Amino acid sequence: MYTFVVRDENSSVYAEVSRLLLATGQWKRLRKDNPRFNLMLGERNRLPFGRLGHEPGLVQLVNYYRGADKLCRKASLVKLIKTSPELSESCTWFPESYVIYPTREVFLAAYNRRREGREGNVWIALISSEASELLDFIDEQGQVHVIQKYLEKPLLLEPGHRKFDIRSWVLVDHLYNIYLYREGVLRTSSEPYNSANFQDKTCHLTNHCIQKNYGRYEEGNEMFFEEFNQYLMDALNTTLENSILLQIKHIIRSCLMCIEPAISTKHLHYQSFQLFGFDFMVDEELKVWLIEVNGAPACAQKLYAELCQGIVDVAISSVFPLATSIFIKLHH
Amino acid sequence: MRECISIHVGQAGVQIGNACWELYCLEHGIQPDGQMPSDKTIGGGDDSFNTFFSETGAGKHVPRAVFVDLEPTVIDEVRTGTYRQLFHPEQLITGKEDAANNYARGHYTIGKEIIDLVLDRIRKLADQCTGLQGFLVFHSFGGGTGSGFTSLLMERLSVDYGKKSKLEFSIYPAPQVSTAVVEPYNSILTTHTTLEHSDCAFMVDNEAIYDICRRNLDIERPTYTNLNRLISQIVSSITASLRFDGALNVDLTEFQTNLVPYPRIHFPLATYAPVISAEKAYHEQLSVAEITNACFEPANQMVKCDPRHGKYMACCLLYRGDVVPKDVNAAIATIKTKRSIQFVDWCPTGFKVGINYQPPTVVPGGDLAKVQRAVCMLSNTTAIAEAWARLDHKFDLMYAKRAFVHWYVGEGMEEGEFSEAREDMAALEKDYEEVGV
Amino acid sequence: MEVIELNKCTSGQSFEVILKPPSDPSLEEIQKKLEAAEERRKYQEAELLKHLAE
Amino acid sequence: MREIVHIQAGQCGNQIGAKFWEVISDEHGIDPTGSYHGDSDLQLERINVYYNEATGNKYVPRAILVDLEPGTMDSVRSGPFGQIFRPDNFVFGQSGAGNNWAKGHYTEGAELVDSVLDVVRKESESCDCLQGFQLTHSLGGGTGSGMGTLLISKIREEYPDRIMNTFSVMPSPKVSDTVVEPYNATLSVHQLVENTDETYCIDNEALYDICFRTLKLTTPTYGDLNHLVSATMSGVTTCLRFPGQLNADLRKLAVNMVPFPRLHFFMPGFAPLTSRGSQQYRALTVPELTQQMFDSKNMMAACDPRHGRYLTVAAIFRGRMSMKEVDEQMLNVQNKNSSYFVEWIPNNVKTAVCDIPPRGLKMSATFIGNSTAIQELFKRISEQFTAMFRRKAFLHWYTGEGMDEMEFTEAESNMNDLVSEYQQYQDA
Ligand SMILES: Nc1nc2c(ncn2[C@@H]2O[C@H](COP(=O)(O)OP(=O)(O)OP(=O)(O)O)[C@@H](O)[C@H]2O)c(=O)[nH]1
Ligand SMILES: Nc1ncnc2c1ncn2[C@@H]1O[C@H](COP(=O)(O)OP(=O)(O)CP(=O)(O)O)[C@@H](O)[C@H]1O
Ligand SMILES: Nc1nc2c(ncn2[C@@H]2O[C@H](COP(=O)(O)OP(=O)(O)O)[C@@H](O)[C@H]2O)c(=O)[nH]1
Ligand SMILES: COc1ccc2c(c1)CCCN2c1nc(Cl)nc2ccoc12
Ligand SMILES: [Ca+2]
Ligand SMILES: [Mg+2]
C-alpha cells in the first residue's frame, strides 16, 4: 500500500486525484504533517522541498517543480524570456513586454515609437492606450506589474464576433516527459468584441469568472476542441492541428526545455512532477501567442475525470505501480 | 611555519580522528611507530607537514592531536590499535561515564569536571608551537559529548586563545546511522552555543556519506569504518593545503577569507568525486571535466541539498592527481554554460583552484579504488540551509510537547536555553534566506 | 575567462579564475553559568532528599 | 566498566530472578560452578556488567536475593544454578509477608531492609562505575511488592543519581493467589511511578493467555509463565550484556525511551513464542520475526497496541541474519503503520542486532514498546481495586498494620492520574 498526504485543500485537480487514489485500495491518506508519505500534494506557497527525500525506506514524489515559479509568475516569465538565449530576445511567439515598479524607461522607448508611427498602441496590466494613464493602477496597488503589448487584431468567431483565449494543460513527469492533454478548451467572450473604448470589461478579457450571456453560444462559455476544429474547417479551410496546435506544441516545448536544467529532479533525492496551464492568444493570421503560464491551474468541469485519471497513469502510477493515451508526448 | 592542533571529541570525533591520522601517515610516509624516513631533518623542522606533526629527538613524528571522550571504550581502541605508538598517552583523555546522549549532561554536569584537565593537556601541545595557528575540532552534533562538551570547550578556547582560528568538522545526525532520538535537541543546542566561536565549519551529513557508500561502493549496510575512511578522504583534501607546499589556503585564517564572507554563514558545502569501488574489476578513469562536473551533482555532496535554488558566496576546487590548469578552465567553461550557478551580486563569479600533483592515497585493503585524479569542491551556498530547516523542524516537533526536556532540566539547564537556541537557529535560517533570494 | 595569481611549485599549482565581477563571553561569566547549573541541580537533589525524608 | 546490581525480592522475584541468572549465564558461557567454559570471547567483553570476578578467575553474579520467608530462597540455593550466587547475598527473614503490602513496606520489611542495604552497599562500593539497579518482583504479593518498593525508595535515597529499573510482574485473576492483589499492585504502582526510571510491565494475564491460546497449553504452571519471562528478560538486556553498534546502558535507555518522567512503563514482546522442552525446527524469516514481534499476541502486557500510540520503540534482533533485511523490515512496519507512532517524536524506533542467539533459537526478536495503550493494564487494576475499596473490603488486613484509608485513596488517585496522562498523549 502506497501512502500520500494532502497539503492544499483548494486544489480541485488534486481533490479529484486523492479521490481516485483512495478508490484504488492501494493508497492510504495520512495526516498532512506525517513525514512518512510516498507522495505529497503540497501547498502552493512555501512548499518545504528541503524536507523531501530524507525518509529512508520511502521513495518520495511531489506534484510541484521547485523553481517552476520562474514560468508561472508574470514578472519572472518576462525576465526569463528576455535573458535566456534559448528564447531571447525576440521569439516570434511572446508579446513585447516590460516589467514595471511603483517605487519603465525602456517601455517608453518603444511607446514613443508606437504613437508617432500611428501603430497600434494598446497595452495591458488594466487596459488603455496612454502610458501614464495606467500608472494610477500600478501605483495605488503597490505590486510589481507587467505592461504588455495588447493584441489589437485577434481572431473572432462567428456568429458572435466573440473573443477567446486557449488553455492547454501540460503534465511534466519525473522523467521530464512533456505530456500535452489532447483536450484543450476555448475560454470564450459572450458579448461582441468592440475596439472603440477599452474599459468595457466583459468583452476584452476572457477569465471564466469574469463573465458572471453566460452560456449563449455553448454551455459555460466553453468550446471543446472538436467544435472549434470543425469551425476552422468550415469557416477558414484548415485544421486546429495545422493552424494553431503546431505553434502551441512548439511554445510548450521551448518554455519547458529552457528551464529543464534548473528544475529537473532526475538525479535528485526526491522526485517532481507538475501540471501546468499554458494560456495562448490566437491573432488575425492564425498566429499563436503565449500569454501566461499557470502553476496551479484548474480544469474545465467536463475534462476533470479524464485528465485526473491520466495524472495517475502517467505521473503517479509510473513511480508507484499497481496490480489509448490521452496525452500527446512532446518529444525532445 | 605555523602549527595546527586537532581536537577530537566524543565517539564520532575520535573514530574520525583515527581515520584521518591513519591517512595522514600514509600520505606523508610516516610509519605506525612514528618514524619518517623521508624526513632528513632529525628532531625538528619548519616543513609543511610539521603543521600537524611534532618531532622527538629519537626521530618520532607525533600528531599535534588530543583525543577527548567522556568514556574510555573508544579511545581505549586507539591506545591498543595499530597506531598505539604514534600518540603520547597524555593526548588520550577519557572519563568514566558518558553524557548519555544528553547535551546538558555533557556540557554542564560532567563537562565541568574534565574541562580544566583538557585545557591543560591542550596547553601542553600549544607550548610546543612557535606560532600556533588554531584548532581543528572533530565531533558529532548528536552525541551528548560531541554536542555538550565541544560547546564548552569551544567557549574556553576563545578566552585562552582569542587570536587563534577554530575550524569544525561536524557530523550531522541521520536516522539510518543515529544512536539517539534526541539528536535534534543536541544539534540545535550545540550549534547555538558554538556559532560565535567557530570561524568555519564543514558539516558532514551521515545520510550523504551512507548513500555514497551504498551507491558508489556497493556496500549494502555501511559501517562506521566505511563512512569514516570516506570522510577522512574529504578531510584530507581540505587540510592538504596546510600539510603540503602550495599557495592556496596555507593558514586557517585563509579558509575564512576565501570561504566565509559573513561570520555566521560559515558552513561551506563539500562535494567530492570520484568515489569508485576497490572491488570494481573494470574502471574507466574519469577526466578533469568529468570529476569537475560531479562537483555539481547533489549525490556527491557531503550534505544533500539543491545548490541550483540558492546562491554562492565562494567556491574552491581542490584537485589531487594528474590535473593542469588548462583542463580545469576548459571544464569550468563548459559547466557554467550547462548548469545553474548563481552568485550573490556582491561577490565575483569565480573559482579559487588549488592543485596537488600527488594523487589521493587510499588505505590498503580499503573500499576506495586508487584514481588518477580527484577533486573536493568547497562551496558556500545558501542551499545548505535546507539542512538547518530539516533539523529545526524535527526540533520543533518534539519541543512543542516538551518531550525529553526533563532529562536536560534535570542536569541543570533551564528550559529557556532550548528556546534561545531555537531562536538563534531561526535567525540563522532568516540570514540564509536574505542572502539567497 | 581571466586567470590570475598563478603560483607554481614542485607539489602542484594554484590560481584564481574569474568569470564576472560583483555588482564574546569571559571566563568569569562561563564559571557563573556552570555554577548556576550545579546550584540548580543540588537544589533539585535537596528537594528530593527532603521529600524522601517525609 | 559500568556495573548493574541485581535484586530479586519475594517468591516471584526470586523465581524469575533465578531463571534469569540461569539463562544469561548459559548465554555467556558460565556453568553452575562459576567457571567459564565458553567458545567465543564476545561472551566476556562485558561480563562485568552483571558479574564480578572472584579468586581463581571465577564469575559471581552481582545479585542480592531477598525474602521475608526463607522457603523460596532455600529452593533457589537447592536449585540448578543456586551455588553460583554469593552466600552472603542471601538476606532472609522468617515471618513472611502474608501477601500484604503493609507488612512488606511498613512492619516486617522494615526490620530486614537495612540488612539488604548493607549487602547492596558492599556490591556498589566494589563497582568501577555503577550504572544502577535491576529489581525483579511481583506487585501482587507482599515482599516483592511492599518490601521491594521500600527498598527502591531507600536505594534512591542513598544513590539518587543512579538508574533504578524494574521487572514488575502484574497480578491477574487468571493466575491469582489472593483477592488482595489489586490492593498490593495499586500501592506498588504509586511507588514505581515516582521511584523508577524504567519498569517492564510483565503481565501475568498476558503470560497466561500466551501459554493457553498460542502455545497450546491447557493448565500452565508458573514454570511455563517463567519460561516466557526469562526469554523476555534475556532479550531486553542483550544490548547491555553484549557489545554492538549501540553500546547501551540503563541511562541511555531511559533517556531515549522516556519522553516524560512518569510514563516509563514498557510493554515487552518476544518472537518467536516458544514453549519449554519442545524445540522449533524452522527458523523464522526476518519478515516473520518483525510481524510477530509487533503482534499483540506476542506482547507480555495484556494491552492492545491499536488502542494507543507508540511513544518510543526499542527492538533487539538476535541471530545470524541480514541487517539490510532487518532495516528494511523495520522501516516497512513504521511506514505501513505510521498512524500508531507519534508524529511529534521523529524516528522513535531504534533497532539493534546481536550475532549470538538465545539458547534454542536460531533467530529471535525482542520488543520494548513505550505505548500509551499500557493504560489498559492500569485501568484494569484500578477497576478491580475500586470494586473492593468501595466497600472497604479486606482493608482490616492493612489497618491492622498501621495504614490509613487515606493511603489507599491517595494511591488510587495517582494511578488514575497516570491513566489520564497516558490518555493525554494518545490524542495529541
Ligand atoms: N560518520 C560517523 N558518525 C558517527 C560515528 N560515531 C558516531 N557517529 C554519529 O554520532 C552520533 C552520536 O554521537 P556519538 O559521537 O556517538 O556520542 P558521543 O559524542 O561519544 O557522546 P555520548 O556517547 O552521548 O556521551 C550519531 O549520529 C552517530 O551516527 C562515526 O564513527 N562516524
Ligand atoms: N497582450 C495581450 N493582448 C491581448 N489580450 C491580452 C493580452 N494579455 C492579456 N490579454 C487578455 O486578458 C486575458 C489574459 O490575461 P491573464 O492571462 O494575465 O489573466 P489571469 O492570469 O488573471 C487568469 P489565468 O491564469 O487562468 O489565465 C485574456 O482575456 C486576454 O485576451
Ligand atoms: N509470572 C509469575 N508470577 C508469579 C510467580 N510467583 C508468584 N507470582 C504472582 O505473584 C503474586 C503473588 O506474589 P508473591 O511473589 O508470591 O508474593 P511475595 O513472595 O510475598 O513477594 C501473584 O500475582 C502471583 O500470581 C512466578 O513464579 N511467576
Ligand atoms: C527509540 O530510540 C532509542 C531506543 C533505545 C535505545 C536508544 C534509542 C539509544 C541507545 C539505548 N537504547 C537501547 N538500549 C537497549 Cl539496552 N536496548 C536497545 C535496543 C534498541 O535500542 C536500545
Ligand atoms: Ca624534520
Ligand atoms: Mg494567472
Ligand SMILES: [Mg+2]
Ligand atoms: Mg559516547
Ligand SMILES: [Mg+2]
Ligand atoms: Mg505466594
